[PDB]
Amino acid sequence: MSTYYFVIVGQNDNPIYEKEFSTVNKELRKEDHRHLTQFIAHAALDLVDEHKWKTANMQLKSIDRFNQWFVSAFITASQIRFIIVHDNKNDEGIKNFFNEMYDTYIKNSMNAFYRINTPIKSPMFEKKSEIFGRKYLLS
Amino acid sequence: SQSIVALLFSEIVQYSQSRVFTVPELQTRLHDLGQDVGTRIIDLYFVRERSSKRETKLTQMLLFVKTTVWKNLFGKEAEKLEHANDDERTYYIIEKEPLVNTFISVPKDKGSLNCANFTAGIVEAVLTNCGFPCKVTAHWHKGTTYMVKFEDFVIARDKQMEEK
Amino acid sequence: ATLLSMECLKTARLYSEVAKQLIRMTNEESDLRSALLLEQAAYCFLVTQPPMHRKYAFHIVLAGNRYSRAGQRKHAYRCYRQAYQVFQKREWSLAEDHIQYTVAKQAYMLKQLEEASRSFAHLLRPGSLQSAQQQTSFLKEYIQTQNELVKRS
Amino acid sequence: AKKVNSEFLTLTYGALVTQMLRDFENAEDVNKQLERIGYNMGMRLIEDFLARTSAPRCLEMRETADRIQQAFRIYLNIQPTISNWSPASDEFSLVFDSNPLTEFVELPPDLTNLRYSAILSGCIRGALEMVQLEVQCWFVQDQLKGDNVTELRVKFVRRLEEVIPAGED
């Protein structure tokens, strides 16, 4: 299995919103791993900058490695970074799964209340995250 | 419709004029609102027109924005997109149709700038979220034009990419 | 071999490569040699470009522990100092807070208290989502800043 | 060609609402000024609604109801439904089906006292002002608030016109 974990990196590089998709265990250690993965979000940020300057497409398969984790990076026209840390990859579905969370994030965009890198608070997006994660990643 | 949007936007402008005691930062409010709309205009129009495809080439992304945003917002794509060779940071997008004067506007005696600044702020938000931060200024040069000033960092990344 | 790589690529300004192969070395061969090689590879990774100090910071403190463990004190101490300065450069006090709890454990005995006091003060438990051990930790921070206030008053 | 997108106007209005809430923390003032600008629009808007249909001012109140009803189809391209008249048969209820300004624009529950789209509820006010028929008009069920479909309640109060078009003023 893969301990899927999603994280948002904003336009101004500050993190925004996470969402676990892992099995239930080691949650106290998972707090330290959450600190770790925010740091990995910054490291991704840094690498995927030049790597997205290498390309012009939406998905950059997987960039960083830490001897157990895989880091999968998604870049948008919103230049947001959507990141998954996961022991074994599931990329083939998450390409369009990122596309669908992209569409939902657009839905939040039309909500002018949600604004530039303004941290997520709506229950709508949280329940969308729950249902989508139970769909593919958390499964 | 057109009257509803033209008016309602006019009340945005004049209510800002209420909260604002002078021309320039009134225009700044217009810019900020243009930003707050473009900040989603960008990635809406991404999927439905750009076919969810990113354009790293400043020319291609800028041209496609020129087509798309004007095609859907105000129907007619802006007439011309030009790059100034003296200053590669500073290009122009001339739109002969004034989107302010679509709703025929105030005498520019007591004031200078208008909804032109609002759509300029839209353009600026689109640029800065496309990974090309820029300064977009409405200018009454050859009618309505938007001067775009690229960050030396952004135009430098571009020039380095423009080393095939 | 990696050191000659380091120097010769430094004769090419393209330090990125040797940055990557030194960082892939330094994980292994020890927990001590891993540490000083972690900072070697780390500052070298930073030699090419000043920013992206992120994993720099992470592994250099996750090796500063080993530095306190089995290292000569001046090098381990320059570890701690340069790591912490790199933290403040681009602040992000979240994990810096726990590493400053470590700053406190070396300050509850040796270093100055006020740095840990202000570090936890900027974290400011409500609104920073601190945890049970973190509330107890800032109780202990109150104890240290009580020592400091008493010594000032 | 309708020369607009529902999303476009929705973005502009949502940004404006954001702007007021950033201006005044209290939703009371944002409601006040939003109804103020609804009055402001509704005064000029009737100048175009009567630029197409030259309906007589008010033979009866159901004429006013149908006029305001067709107004939104003219502008917002939505057909409201008129129903729920009193035994007095002066008031009525009006159903807005879909609101372009609303479309997936959530509201903060920490902001409930706001009446978001009451600009329309004021536009008719500003409209009803102009034809010399002031009206106590507001919502009884709000699709915004969590209700099924939007439902505004119109209580007409009094007239301002004599057997002459000039009327009292």
From Swiss-Prot, chain A:
Location of this chain's protein in the cell: Cytoplasm, Perinuclear region; Endoplasmic reticulum; Golgi apparatus
GO (cellular component) term, any one: TRAPPIII protein complex
Pfam families from the UniProt entry: Sedlin_N
GO biological process assignments: endoplasmic reticulum to Golgi vesicle-mediated transport; Golgi vesicle transport; spermatogenesis
UniProtKB keywords: Cytoplasm, Endoplasmic reticulum, ER-Golgi transport, Golgi apparatus, Transport
Membrane-spanning parts: none
Primary location class: cytoplasm
Record-linked InterPro entries: Longin-like_dom_sf, Sedlin
CDD domains noted in UniProt: TRAPPC2_sedlin
Function (record text): May play a role in vesicular transport from endoplasmic reticulum to Golgi. Involved in dsRNA uptake.
Subunit structure of this chain's protein: Part of the multisubunit TRAPP (transport protein particle) complex.
Family affiliation: Belongs to the TRAPP small subunits family. Sedlin subfamily.
Protein name per the record: Probable trafficking protein particle complex subunit 2
Species the sequence originates in: Drosophila melanogaster (Fruit fly)
The gene coding this protein: Trs20
